[PDB]
Design a protein around this ligand. Structure first.
Ligand SMILES: [Ca+2]
Ligand SMILES: [Ca+2]
Length: 479
């Protein structure tokens, strides 16, 4: 008699987001409001009078139960919550018990409560069921329902699920990862920021979670580098361009719109000084086209070494963040070092005696980022006192390896790979390494060279002589 008390499907647990969309066995963003709806079908006619009508729902871990939201959605019940066992119980009021017992010869439609909370963890599966016991004589156990948040691989319901890991790598223009490498003055860091969106494929988040926006933050070292605002570009993982991503630079977080600071503090992101904020313009179109389709974006964010910072040297760090649906995830930190270049000069007298200016070049340290395209010696002598004979010899100052594999020994004459020229107007000798020899050198080998400029005194007295070394068209004085 009691197995036919509730009607056709009897009971049915449903799980929805805040737009009322069935999200069972699908994927939803972290912090999403998730409604457990404990539907119960009409009571058959010819029943006994209903003493009790009790639904008990043990809630899953990671689901933060909201008491006043679930009470408002469960009129006709009285809501009790056991915090120690994550269990919520709904007991039908005597007023809807009365409407269940108004005429037992007709079917009556029964009320149902709704649990309202939000999921709190990434890469978690949330399971739920509930039991309904009536008149402590029957009792029915419901079907299990599932929702999953992105962040865990090998999810059987979503085969694209994985770790939400935004990545940042430093590249030159050839695409070589230069993480941790040395970077010479005037060079540019072609930073690659990945906007990790693969795992969000199949997401059914609400329309207001999407309205929290989609952003990318880059905490760039403002004290060492300058942004190249016209070379920032957002592309998908293949190469096609992305228009719908705007970029704004802020010199400090405290000098930024209060919306932006609220954004970062609700994602637990804090920035050292200046940062960039990539925005989605219209988040809804950005969602349908990149988030819901699981197509990650790539942001090339090139920045160049300041002039002064190349002369002082030091180290700098870049770090980025990804902010989807309001939730923040952080890249690892990429580190680079700028070497301080300081060439020196000695001499090696008496009227018309020949002598050499020894011009030692700057040390290009091991494990550098960019190809050498310029290593030149520039000597501005006093033509009224000394004159340049026209002979000179350039030697490596250390052991040079390169791409073929050979190692050029320390002290080897490299003058058959140089090119001099003379400016008689100002009195300037310029010994240059050509490009095709410099661009034959491995990026992991060091580089240093010296030239001996043969000169002779043609006047009495002492005379000043300035020497300037050049590496990739940045000029270093000397002492
Ligand atoms: Ca910064
Ligand atoms: Ca001169």
């Amino acid at each position: 008699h009691y197995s036919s008390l509730l009607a056709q499907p009897q009971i049915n647990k449903e799980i929805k987001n805040e737009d009322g969309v069935d999200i069972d066995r699908t994927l939803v963003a972290k912090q999403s409001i998730v409604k457990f709806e404990l539907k119960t079908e009409a009571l058959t006619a010819g029943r006994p009078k209903t003493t009790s009508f009790v639904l008990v729902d043990p809630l899953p871990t990671g689901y933060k139960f909201d008491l006043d939201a679930t009470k408002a959605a469960s009129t006709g019940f009285d809501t009790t919550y056991d915090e120690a066992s994550h269990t919520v119980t709904f007991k039908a009021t005597d007023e809807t018990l009365a409407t269940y017992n108004a005429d037992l010869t007709k079917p009556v439609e029964t009320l149902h409560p709704t649990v309202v909370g939000r999921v709190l963890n990434d890469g978690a599966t949330y399971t739920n069921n509930f039991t309904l016991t009536v008149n402590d004589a029957y009792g029915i156990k419901s079907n299990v329902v599932r929702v999953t948040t992105p962040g865990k691989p090998n999810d059987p319901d979503n085969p694209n699920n994985n770790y939400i890991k935004p990545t940042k790598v430093n590249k030159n223009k050839e695409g070589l990862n230069i993480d941790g490498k040395e970077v010479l003055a005037g060079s540019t860091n072609y930073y690659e920021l990945t906007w990790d969106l693969d795992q969000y494929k199949g997401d059914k988040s609400s329309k207001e979670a999407i309205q929290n926006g989609f952003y990318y933050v880059d905490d760039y070292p403002e004290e060492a580098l300058d942004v190249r605002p016209d070379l920032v570009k957002v592309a998908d993982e293949k190469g096609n361009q992305v228009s719908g991503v705007s970029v704004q630079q802020y010199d400090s977080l405290e000098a930024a719109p209060k919306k932006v600071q609220d954004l970062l503090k609700k994602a637990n992101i804090t920035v050292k000084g200046a940062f960039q904020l990539f925005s989605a313009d219209n988040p809804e179109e950005f969602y349908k086209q990149y988030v819901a389709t699981g197509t990650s974006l790539v942001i090339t964010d090139p920045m160049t070494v300041k002039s002064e910072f190349g002369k002082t040297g030091g180290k700098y760090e870049n770090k980025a963040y990804q902010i989807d649906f309001g939730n923040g995830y952080a890249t690892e930190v990429v580190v680079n070092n700028v070497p301080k270049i300081t060439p020196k000069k000695d001499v090696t007298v008496q009227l018309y005696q020949t002598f050499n200016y020894r011009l030692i070049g700057g040390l290009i340290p091991q494990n550098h980022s960019e190809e050498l395209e310029d290593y030149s010696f520039v000597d501005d002598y006093d033509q009224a006192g000394d004159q340049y004979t026209g002979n000179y010899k350039t030697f490596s100052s250390l052991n040079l390896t390169m791409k073929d594999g050979s190692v050029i020994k320390a002290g080897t004459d490299l003058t058959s790979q140089t090119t001099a020229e003379t400016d008689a107007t100002n009195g300037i000798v310029t010994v240059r390494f050509k490009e095709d020899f410099l661009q034959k050198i491995s990026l992991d080998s060091p580089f240093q060279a010296e030239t001996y400029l043969q000169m002779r005194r043609i006047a009495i007295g002492t005379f000043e002589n300035t020497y300037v070394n050049t590496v990739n068209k940045v000029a270093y004085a000397s002492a």
